[PDB]
């Protein structure tokens, strides 16, 4: 007789309407754990304080999606939150410019591309443009 354990818990961000028995259990092992995550489909709709400005009434709502544990890393978090992903693209642009990897015309074009995102706030856009060296 094998040793079978039943892990019961809130593995999702919301309850299911499915009756408790009706929902089925999932067999998990080292050769398919990530696949189990992807098939389970993880999603988090949540609001945190918006610390990209200086307004206590500013809040940021995010909708993160998870298929594997690597999706919990800050890189994925930034990839899934445009208010931060645009700032990471701006970071790459500034490092490329400061390292002399690209010329000023390319820098300007890419900057316009980054700031064009309609989901960004004008305040955030101004804070990002304030980081560009005058030259």
């Amino acid at each position: 007789l094998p040793l079978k354990v039943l892990m019961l818990g809130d593995f999702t961000g919301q309850e299911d309407a499915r009756p408790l028995e009706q929902r089925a259990p999932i067999n998990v092992d080292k050769a398919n754990f990530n696949e189990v995550m992807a098939q389970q489909n993880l999603k988090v709709t949540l609001t945190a304080a918006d610390k990209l400005s200086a307004d206590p009434n500013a809040t940021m709502n995010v909708s993160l999606q998870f298929k594997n544990l690597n999706d919990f890393s800050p890189e994925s978090v930034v990839n899934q939150v445009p208010e931060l992903k645009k700032l990471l693209e701006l970071r790459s642009a500034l490092n490329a410019l400061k390292g002399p990897l690209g010329n000023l015309p390319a820098f300007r074009k890419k900057l316009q591309a980054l700031l064009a995102d309609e989901d960004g706030r004008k305040a955030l856009i101004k804070e990002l443009g304030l980081t560009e060296e005058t030259k």
């Binding site: 040793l3 354990v5 892990m7 945190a48 919990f72 931060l84 980081t131």
Partner: protein, 414 residues
């Protein structure tokens, strides 16, 4: 000129990390993450080649109460359906070894009732239910206040714990097991110790240790059971730093103190022997931290059930011994494995020409398979043969042709 651009990158990364901290320290995000990551921490420490299996059941405590209260009886609950009915009570199936619930329990009436239902189901299926206790159960904001508690036994005398007190006296409490402090699952992000790609992120844990990704120790206990079974096919060796109750490889986090350096304890507090003993008297499974290392240990796995006191005579002390044996999970597991084997193997014998004495002989010969009655078997080798003595008696129920009443009593190694 480039120095100014680098300063721009420093400020930009500063703001970005300011927000990323809000995301990574969000309670909902940490709930999901700690759920999955603790799950993997359990799974990757087992050995599926040793006949070990694990199933996931998505259920919240509120919905567990909803199902148990909606059903007219526990035998008609969905959880009972998928635990007992589809397993232990199914010819050709297999019984669930144990149930690990990723929940924290308070003294609240809803939590108490949930514990009652789980004790009933675990008793019916012969499988213990393991979970964790929340810090507020001790009347403290967080486990970090445990050293300030002068007397837990006196703390538990308040009327706030009346329901828990009765629960400890129920005979189903033997199938309930709750753990104490949580344990770190992830070391905070840092350019050296835990770096990320591209963005130079340095996670800033504030004064609130709740910023740390704490994890439910029930999974660690489950790993203990898994290892014992992977080595011996039995689950008794899970209560010692050398016996098999040691949790090794805990995360560490050195940071500046008052001018010196200190590591965040993998458990919220460094439990002393006296405090651990008190928690054990209170029926809690405390994972103690080995000071100055990355190892913890479960010194004992007592169930929630409180032992009964009998008259100090020979028979009364014998009764006390048996009862406490019942109160201990390290022996409860042997009993549960025996029940599973009995159900399965007897089902296959239904229909054979069996007289009472035939039952006696066969059952004796079978029970002998797990008995090590030598003068001194190799230590931790009576692990594979946990029993030292065993007695079986078979009578006939009177009134019909061919069913019996069997009594099996076992003396396992101490």
């Amino acid at each position: 000129d480039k120095a100014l651009v680098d300063a721009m990158i420093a400020e930009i990364d500063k703001r970005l990390s300011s927000q990323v901290n809000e995301i990574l320290h969000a309670k909902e995000f940490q709930k999901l993450e700690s759920s999955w990551r603790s799950l993997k921490f359990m799974v990757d420490r087992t050995d599926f080649r040793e006949n070990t299996r694990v199933e996931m059941l998505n259920a919240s405590k509120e919905d567990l109460q909803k199902d148990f209260e909606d059903a007219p009886e526990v035998t008609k609950s969905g959880l009972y359906k998928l635990v007992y009915s589809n397993e232990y009570g199914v010819f050709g199936g297999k019984p669930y070894g144990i149930i690990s619930a990723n929940y924290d329990f308070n003294v609240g009436p809803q939590d108490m009732e949930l514990l009652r239902k789980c004790a009933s189901v675990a008793a019916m299926a012969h499988a213990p239910f393991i979970g964790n206790a929340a810090p507020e159960v001790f009347g403290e904001e967080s486990f970090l206040k445990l050293p300030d508690l002068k007397d837990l036994k006196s703390l538990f005398e308040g009327p706030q714990y009346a329901r828990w007190h009765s629960f400890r006296e129920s005979e189903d409490a033997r199938y309930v097991g709750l753990a104490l402090p949580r344990f770190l699952l992830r070391l905070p992000y840092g350019e050296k110790t835990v770096p990320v790609k591209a963005f130079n992120f340095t996670e800033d844990v504030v004064g609130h240790h709740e910023r740390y990704l704490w994890g439910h120790a029930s999974v660690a206990l489950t790993s203990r059971v898994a290892d014992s079974f992977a080595k011996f096919r039995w689950s008794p060796n899970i209560i010692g730093p050398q016996s098999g109750g040691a949790v090794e490889n805990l995360p560490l986090h050195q940071y500046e103190a008052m001018g010196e350096i200190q590591t965040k304890i993998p458990t919220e507090v460094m439990l002393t022997e006296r405090r651990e003993f008190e928690l054990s008297e209170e029926g809690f499974i405390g994972l103690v931290f080995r000071k100055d290392s990355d190892n913890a240990a479960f010194f004992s796995a007592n169930s929630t059930q409180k032992p009964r006191f009998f008259g100090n005579t020979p028979e009364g002390k014998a009764a006390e011994t048996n009862y406490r044996l019942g109160t201990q999970l390290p022996y409860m597991f042997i009993m549960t494995r025996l029940a599973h084997y009995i159900k399965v193997l007897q089902r296959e014998q239904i229909g054979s020409w069996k007289e009472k004495s035939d039952l006696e002989r066969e059952l004796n010969h079978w029970l002998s398979q797990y008995i090590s009655d030598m003068d001194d078997p190799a230590p931790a080798v009576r692990s594979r043969r946990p029993l030292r003595a065993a007695r079986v008696v078979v009578e006939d129920v009177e009134g019909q042709p061919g069913w019996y009443r069997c009594s099996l009593q076992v003396r396992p190694h101490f």
